[PDB]
Amino acid sequence: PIHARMQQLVSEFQNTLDALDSVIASRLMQMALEAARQVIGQTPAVDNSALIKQIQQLLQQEPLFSGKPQLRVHPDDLQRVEEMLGATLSLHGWRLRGDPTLHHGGCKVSADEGDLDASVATRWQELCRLAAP
Amino acid sequence: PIHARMQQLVSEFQNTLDALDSVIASRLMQMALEAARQVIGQTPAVDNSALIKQIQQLLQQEPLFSGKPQLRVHPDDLQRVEEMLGATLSLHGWRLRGDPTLHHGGCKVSADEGDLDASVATRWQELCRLAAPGV
Amino acid sequence: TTRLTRWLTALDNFEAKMALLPAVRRYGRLTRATGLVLEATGLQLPLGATCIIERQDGPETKEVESEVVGFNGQRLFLMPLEEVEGILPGARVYARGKQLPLGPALLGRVLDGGGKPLDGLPAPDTLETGALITPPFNPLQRTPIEHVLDTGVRAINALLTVGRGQRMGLFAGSGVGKSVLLGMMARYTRADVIVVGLIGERGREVKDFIENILGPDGRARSVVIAAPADVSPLLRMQGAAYATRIAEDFRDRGQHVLLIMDSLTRYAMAQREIALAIGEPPATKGYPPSVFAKLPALVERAGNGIHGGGSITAFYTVLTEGDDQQDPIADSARAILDGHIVLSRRLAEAGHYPAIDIEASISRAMTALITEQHYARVRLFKQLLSSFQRNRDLVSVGAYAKGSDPMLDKAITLWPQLEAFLQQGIFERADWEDSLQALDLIFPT
Ligand SMILES: Nc1ncnc2c1ncn2[C@@H]1O[C@H](COP(=O)(O)OP(=O)(O)O)[C@@H](O)[C@H]1O
């Protein structure tokens, strides 16, 4: 049925987003270095451990990668979707919402920023400490 | 009925994800670029090896400027370039200045007619465009 | 990792594009602005070159787009695509093949000559680009016209027959139902893709055409390039230029496209502004010689592709303004075209729509596309028609009686059916069969 398809979408998609964390840091570094090189005209001398940490932070700054996807649909088909994908979506931690603007039988995917209280509570543990030069 | 528009959402949902593939990849490029941006700004370096080659190339680039040409580099590349190519510059009739706003490893030649811009500042712009034909 | 591989690939392909980036960028200097045309020096460029002029915003350095329309060997004559207010004496100038979005992505979309979205949606996903400038298809390696192209308009299909790859004119005037006729075709024409260039059309009418004429029906199978009357003539020409380029690509994919250029008059008029600005004397009508080098060029791009290929069948609207044929563009159109659909003002004011002059119109590929039994019927239809319109008065006074004139007698007996056959309606579709079979209900067999 359609069930497998939509569930495999959410399955596959989220899964791909997950794979990013393990495999995407070094990849973005190699690119960052190429960019630098092509611009400056020579390979610069850069601390790799330092640099690769800078990217992980950059990554943590994209809610889509750091948080979970938000599937928001039309209120009319709202109940219909949640009945179909509700179980599969919850497992992967996806929020779901109706969007008044979206047309009947239509769908839009954004990266949810969650709750203000949560975002704040998280920053304290990060802001709590300071490194040394 | 159900199958009619319950598939609508299925393929609408499929299309929406496919839509992000270019957006998400691009977003990932932006991350590496900012890092690149950081390393560039982060560091000076003692090799004019590439800069010294570009200036050589510029000197021989035609058409030639008669406009009282002046080569500008960051004061930090200045002394070293002055030594290596400073004789050749004078032979070409160019003069040299420090420009505080040029990043290391890049230069600009200015005359009345126009400029040869070897700045890494403009090469970055060129780069970002390659990544975003929108800009 | 189907999706994952897409991403990595996307990334990998960008890192290879880095190698390309230019080490150095040459600048010229803008020497003179006294008028629409600007003079720059220090960089030498080909005609059509897009030239950027740097304007200082304070901390921000904005770019003003500009184009090379001419030169004195030392000087480069630039024309702006936007306002030069705020440009300094001796401002910096540099040159930036410009890539444009092509593909099934464009379907359902409204874009300008630049390729930018006019419907308030993001740029299309551009997996592929192309260049406005493409080496002209060599007609040597293209294929002839064997196939009727169903235009969904009965009068055309039956009476003036067109076939794939044929490039046809539409001559008309304001208020005769030109815009609608085009809509009807864009909706009912049987073809893989519909490209509609709207060039020089009024801004508000462009919206009227897309919202209320093309409809969602045809909006969905159509790609709409729009350069209105407010923009610069360079941007209008780009509009026709970009419209043709698209259709060309679609053709290269095995697709059969309908290309509607509204209008060829405006294209021409747009060249005239530019030509005059650069001091090219108006040799023919007060239309400079370039105008007539241009029209052939833009029209020859349409046609059938490789055999077992795909094709561009086009309609280039010419606005024949007032009672006319004095107009050289309409003549150049006639000379370079495969025949033309002529809209009658008399018919339009009579509520007869689409108002098409079966007399004035012609399609040269017609006899090649139809049966002699059909072609016989065609001629008759016209002769009966002609008989009626000349003598239509006397019939009213009761002046005419049978036995004197065989045509006018037949014609006037068939008139309500003929009149009904030629008339169609905005939402009324006439297929190939529908048209042919309609013919039989009258004459044969
Ligand atoms: N097939 C038709 N049936 C009924 N009315 C028509 C038909 N074709 C044209 N008309 C009338 O003629 C007018 C055509 O206007 P339009 O085509 O926009 O003018 P232009 O000739 O400048 O394109 C419309 O207002 C419409 O009422």
- Is residue C28 a known part of a binding site? no
Host H or E run for residue A75: helix A75-92
Query: CA–CA separation, C117 vs C224, rounded Å?
Result: 10
Experimental method of this PDB entry: X-ray
Quote the ligand 1 centre to A119 CA distance (angstroms). Answer: 59
**DSSP class per residue in C361-413:** ---TTHHHHS-HHHHHHHHHHHHHHHHHHHHHHHHHHT---TTS-HHHHHHHH
Count of alpha carbons within 13 angstroms of residue B69, beta-carbon side: 22
Cα within 13 Å of Cα(B101), Cβ side: 3
- Residue whose CA lies nearest to ligand 1 atom number 10: C177
Q: For an interface test with B, which of C1, C4, C25, C127 has the most B Cβ atoms less than 10 Å from its Cβ? A: C25
Look at residue C285 and give its three-state secondary structure: coil
Whether the Cβ atoms of residue C261 and residue C268 lie closer than 8 Å to each other:
no
What residues contact residue A51 under an 8 Å CB cut-off, 6+ apart? Answer: A29, A32, B35, B39
User: Measured between CA atoms, how close is B132 to chain C, in angstroms?
Assistant: 10
Contact B29 C18 (CB under 8 A): no
Residues of chain B contacting A107 with CB distance shorter than 8 Å = 9, 12-13, 16
- Please identify which residue in the block is written with the tokens 């030509």: C275
Separation CA C164–CA C166 (nearest Å): 5
**Hey, is the C-beta of C8 within 8 angstroms of any chain A C-beta?**
yes
Q: How far apart are CA C84 and CA C92, in angstroms?
A: 13
Query: What's the gap in Å between C351 CA and the centre of ligand 1?
Result: 9
Which residues lie closer than 8 Å to A24 by C-beta, 6 or more apart?
A59, B28
Q: Which of A13, A28, A29, A31 has the most C C-beta neighbours within 10 Å, making it the best mutation to test the interface with C?
A: A31
* H-helix segments, C225-307: 233-252, 264-277, 291-300
Amino acid at C261: M
CA C318 and chain centroid, separation: 10
Q: In what order do the strands lie in the sheet with A95-98?
A: A95-98, A69-73, A107-111
For the four alpha carbons of C418, C420, C421 and C422, in that order, the dihedral sign comes to positive
* Strand residues in chain A grouped as ranges (E): 69-73, 95-98, 107-111
Backbone angles phi, psi at A106, to 5 degrees: -150, 165
Q: Which CATH number fits domain B49-130: 3.30.2320, 1.10.3470, 3.40.50, 3.30.700?
A: 3.30.2320
Distance (Å, rounded) from C-alpha C305 to C-alpha C250?
11
Q: Which of residues 116-175 of C touch B (CB under 8 A)?
A: 123, 125-127, 129
C307, exposed or middle or buried, with CB in 10 Å at 0-12, 13-18, 19+? exposed
Q: CA separation (Å) from C44 to B108, B118, C17, C74, C142?
A: 19, 19, 26, 8, 37
Dist. CA C396–CA B80, nearest whole Å: 103
Query: Which helix or strand (DSSP H or E) is residue A41 part of?
Result: none
Q: State the Cα–Cα distance between residues B13 and A73, nearest whole angstrom.
A: 9
**Among all chains, which residue has been given the structure tokens 């712009």?**
B125
Q: How many CB atoms sit inside 10 A of residue C208's CB?
A: 14
DSSP 8-state code for residue C105 = G
Whether C20 has its CB under 8 Å from any CB of chain B: the answer is: yes
Q: Do B12 and A107 touch (CB under 8 A)?
A: yes
Q: Cβ distance B105 to B51 under 8 Å?
A: yes
Could you tell me where the beta strands, DSSP code E, fall in A40-125?
Answer: 69-73, 95-98, 107-111
Q: Would you state the structure tokens that stand for residue C412, as one six-digit string?
A: 């006037």
Residue numbers in B near A9 (CB within 8 A): 13-14, 17
| Phi, psi of C207, deg, nearest 5 | -60, -45
A105 contacts A57 by C-beta, under 8 angstroms: no
- C183 ligand 1 Cβ < 6 A: no
Measured between alpha carbons, how far is B15 from C47 in angstroms, rounded to an integer?
42
- Show Cβ contacts of residue B23 under 8 Å, excluding neighbours closer than 6 positions: none
Q: Which of B19, B58, B130 sits opposite C18 (nearest CB)?
A: B130
Q: Which of C23, C308, C26, C28 is nearest to C146 (CA)?
A: C308
Contacts C16 to A, Cβ<8 Å: none
Beta pairing, strands B108-110 & C38-41: unpaired
Q: What is the largest CA-CA distance in chain A?
A: 59
Taking the C-alpha atoms of residue C139 and residue C125, their distance in angstroms, rounded to an integer, is 32
Beta-carbon separation of A104 and B33 below 8 A: no
Chain C contact probe: residue of B122, B125, B128, B135 with most C CBs at under 10 A: B122
Chain C residue at shortest CA distance from A40: C23
Instruction: Please check whether residue C4 touches B, CB under 8 A.
Output: no
Helix (H) or strand (E) holding B114: none
Whether residue C179 has its Cβ less than 6 Å from ligand 1: yes
Q: Kindly give the number of the ligand 1 atom that is closest to the alpha carbon of C172.
A: 21
β-strand partners of C95: C51
Contacts of residue C119, Cβ cutoff 8 Å, sequence gap at least 6: C109, C110
Distance from CA of B111 to the nearest CA of A (A): 24
Tokens representing residue C222 in the block: 């159509």
Provide the b/e sequence for C122-154 (b: ≥16 CB within 10 Å): eebebeeebebeeeebeeeeebebeebbbbbbb
Task: Calculate the alpha carbon distances from C192 to C114, C149, C159, C239, C255 in Å.
Answer: 24, 11, 24, 21, 6
SS3 state at C112: coil
- Smallest CA-to-CA distance from C354 within C338, C340, C363, C342 is with C342
Known binder of ligand: residue C277?
Answer: no
Q: How far from B31 is each of A15, A58, C10, C123, CA to CA, in Å?
A: 21, 6, 14, 22
Angstrom distance (rounded) from CA C261 to CA C346? 25
Does ligand 1 come within 6 angstroms of the Cβ of C177? yes
Report d(CA B54, CA C143) in Å as an integer: 52
Handedness of CA C196, C200, C203, C208 (dihedral sign): negative
Q: Rounded distance, CA C370 to CA C361, Å?
A: 17
Nearest CA to CA, how far is B83 from chain C (Å)? 23
Contacts of C193 (CB under 8 A, 6+ apart): C107, C221, C222, C223, C247, C250, C255, C256, C257, C258
Q: Are C338 and C168 in contact (CB under 8 A)?
A: yes
A80 and B33: CB-CB below 8 Å?
A: no
Q: Strands B115-117 and B108-110, how do they pair?
A: antiparallel
Distance CA C356, CA C342 (A): 6
Residue A26 · residue A52 · CB < 8 Å: yes
Taking the CA of residue A92 and the nearest CA in chain B, the distance in Å comes to 16
| Torsion, Cα of C275, C33, C25, B90 (10° steps) | 130
Are B101 and B72 spatial neighbours (Cβ–Cβ below 8 Å)? no
Subunit contact C1:A27, Cβ cutoff 8 A: no
Cα–Cα distance, C234 to C203 (Å, whole number) = 17
CA-CA distance, A122 to A58, in Å (whole number)?
Answer: 16
**What distance lies between CA C124 and its chain's CA centroid?**
22
Q: How far is the CA of C14 from the CAs of C44, C56, C100, in angstroms?
A: 30, 31, 18
Cβ of C176 closer than 6 Å to ligand 1, yes or no, is: yes
Beta-bridge mates of residue C56: C61
d(CA C204, CA C211): 11
Contact C319, C343 (CB under 8 A): no
C177 among annotated binding-site residues? yes
For C352, phi then psi, to 5°, come to: -90, 110
Which tokens go with A70? 């938000």
* Residue A78 touches partner B, C-beta closer than 8 Å: no
Chains that touch C (3 or more CB pairs under 8 A): A, B
The DSSP bridge partners found for residue C77 are C39, C70
Q: Among all chains, which residue has been given the structure tokens 């297929």? A: C431
- The reply to whether residue A42 touches residue B105, judged by beta carbons under 8 angstroms, is yes
Q: Within 10 A of C237 (CB to CB), how many other CB atoms are there?
A: 24
Cα(C221)–Cα(C188) distance, integer angstroms: 11
Which helix (H) or strand (E) is C163 found in, with range?
A: none
Residues 296-335 of C with CB under 8 A from B: none
Q: What's the CA-to-centroid distance between A9 and ligand 1, angstroms?
A: 48
Nearest chain C residue (CA) to B66? C42
d(CA C240, CA C245): 8
Determine whether A92 is exposed, middle or buried from the number of CB atoms within 10 Å of its CB (0-12, 13-18, 19+): middle
Tell me if A31 and B27 make a contact (CB, 8 A cut-off): no
φ, ψ (nearest 5 deg) of residue C249: -55, -55
Q: In the beta sheet, which residues pair with residue C41?
A: C29, C75
Return the residue whose CA atom lies nearest to atom 4 of ligand 1. Answer: C425
Both tokens of residue B92? 């070409």
Give Cα A31 to chain centroid, integer Å: 20
CB-based contact C14 A12, cutoff 8 Å: no
Measure C354 CA to ligand 1 centroid, in angstroms: 8
C95 lines ligand 1 (CB under 6 A): no
Neighbours of chain A (3+ CB pairs under 8 A): B, C
Written as one string, the DSSP assignment of B18-85 is HHHHHHHHHHHHHHHHHHHHHHHHH---S--HHHHHHHHHHHT-SSPP-S--EEEE-HHHHHHHHHHH
CB C119 within 8 A of CB C109: yes
Tell me the three state secondary structure of residue A23. helix
Phi, psi of C380 (to 5 degrees): -50, -50
What's the gap between Cα C150 and its chain centre?
19
Classify C194 as helix, strand or coil: strand
